[PDB]
Design a protein around this motif. Structure first.
Motif, short mmCIF file in Angstrom:
data_model
loop_
_atom_site.label_atom_id
_atom_site.label_comp_id
_atom_site.label_asym_id
_atom_site.label_seq_id
_atom_site.Cartn_x
_atom_site.Cartn_y
_atom_site.Cartn_z
N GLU A 8 0.98 -1.50 0.12
CA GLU A 8 0.11 0.20 -0.15
C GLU A 8 0.93 1.18 0.11
N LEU A 11 -0.86 4.56 -0.60
CA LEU A 11 -1.57 5.02 0.39
C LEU A 11 -0.76 5.68 1.25
N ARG A 14 -0.03 9.02 -0.02
CA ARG A 14 -1.03 10.21 0.01
C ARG A 14 -0.96 10.97 1.49
N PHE A 32 -2.74 3.97 11.76
CA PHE A 32 -3.28 3.80 10.54
C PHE A 32 -2.39 4.98 9.34
N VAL A 34 -1.61 0.79 8.71
CA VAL A 34 -0.83 -0.30 9.44
C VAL A 34 0.43 -0.24 8.30
N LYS A 36 2.68 -2.84 6.45
CA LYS A 36 2.65 -4.07 5.66
C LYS A 36 3.78 -4.31 4.67
N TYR A 170 -10.45 6.65 4.52
CA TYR A 170 -9.73 5.35 4.22
C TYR A 170 -9.67 4.31 5.20
C1 LIG Z 1 -6.66 3.48 -3.04
C2 LIG Z 1 -5.33 3.15 -2.28
C3 LIG Z 1 -4.79 4.51 -1.85
C4 LIG Z 1 -5.81 2.44 -0.95
C5 LIG Z 1 -6.77 2.83 -0.36
C6 LIG Z 1 -7.32 2.08 1.04
C7 LIG Z 1 -6.52 0.65 1.05
C8 LIG Z 1 -7.13 -0.14 2.28
N1 LIG Z 1 -6.09 -0.05 3.58
C9 LIG Z 1 -6.62 1.34 4.24
C10 LIG Z 1 -5.84 1.08 5.64
C11 LIG Z 1 -4.88 -0.14 5.67
O1 LIG Z 1 -4.15 -0.20 7.13
C12 LIG Z 1 -5.21 -1.52 5.44
C13 LIG Z 1 -6.27 -1.61 4.10
C14 LIG Z 1 -5.42 0.60 0.26
C15 LIG Z 1 -5.13 1.55 -0.64
#
Ligand SMILES: CC(C)c1ccc(CN2CCC(O)CC2)cc1
Length: 171
Positions: A8, A11, A14, A32, A34, A36, A170
């Protein structure tokens, strides 16, 4: 070749473009996003433990002034060396490589009040670091990767309302 890739990363990036913040509390708060990671190039047959610590990024603390993070004074003495042991430890290379390794259960705290928690200084920037420790190794071989995309400032409360909104969006 050993490779440890951030999961991720988009994520994380961002959050990083805003300056990432992680809440620290007395009783400890999960991160948040997390942390990984994906792993290749371990010996599938060997056993390893995964450790997580947090390296202080700067010789100064930070402050949020006029919607901007700026240098905010001399740093507090370094937080006492806390390492989080990933709960699947120890385990086979094959285990760590078959699926993303998630540190979802680690709690960040500003009070030494016990229970696998990591002590951080408010308004300091940290960079997560993962260690892979080979078990039964008389040379105690360790490997360490840092994750610059995952840098954050420890806060007792969110400063940037845009981070507050991203955490809600998110999570
Ligand atoms: C579209 C992209 C930016 C995105 C958005 C959301 C996630 C899901 N993710 C969010 C929180 C984490 O700790 C576990 C799951 C992953 C990628």
């Amino acid at each position: 070749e050993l490779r440890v890739g951030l999961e991720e990363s988009e994520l994380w990036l961002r959050f990083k473009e805003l300056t990432n913040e992680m809440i620290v509390t007395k009783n400890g708060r999960r991160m948040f996003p997390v942390l990984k990671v994906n792993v290749s190039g371990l010996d599938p047959n060997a056993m390893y433990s995964f450790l997580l610590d947090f390296v202080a990024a700067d010789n100064h603390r930070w402050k949020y002034v006029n919607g901007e993070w700026v240098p905010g004074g001399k740093p507090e003495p370094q937080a006492p060396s806390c390492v989080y042991i990933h709960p699947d430890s120890p385990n086979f290379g094959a285990h760590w490589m078959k699926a993303p390794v998630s540190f979802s259960k680690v709690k960040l705290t500003n009070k030494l009040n016990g229970g696998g928690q990591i002590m951080l200084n408010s308004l300091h920037k940290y960079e997560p670091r993962i260690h892979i420790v080979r078990v039964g190794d008389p040379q105690r071989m360790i490997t360490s990767h840092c994750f610059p995309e995952t840098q954050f400032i420890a806060v007792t409360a969110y400063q940037n309302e845009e981070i507050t909104a991203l955490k809600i969006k998110y999570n």
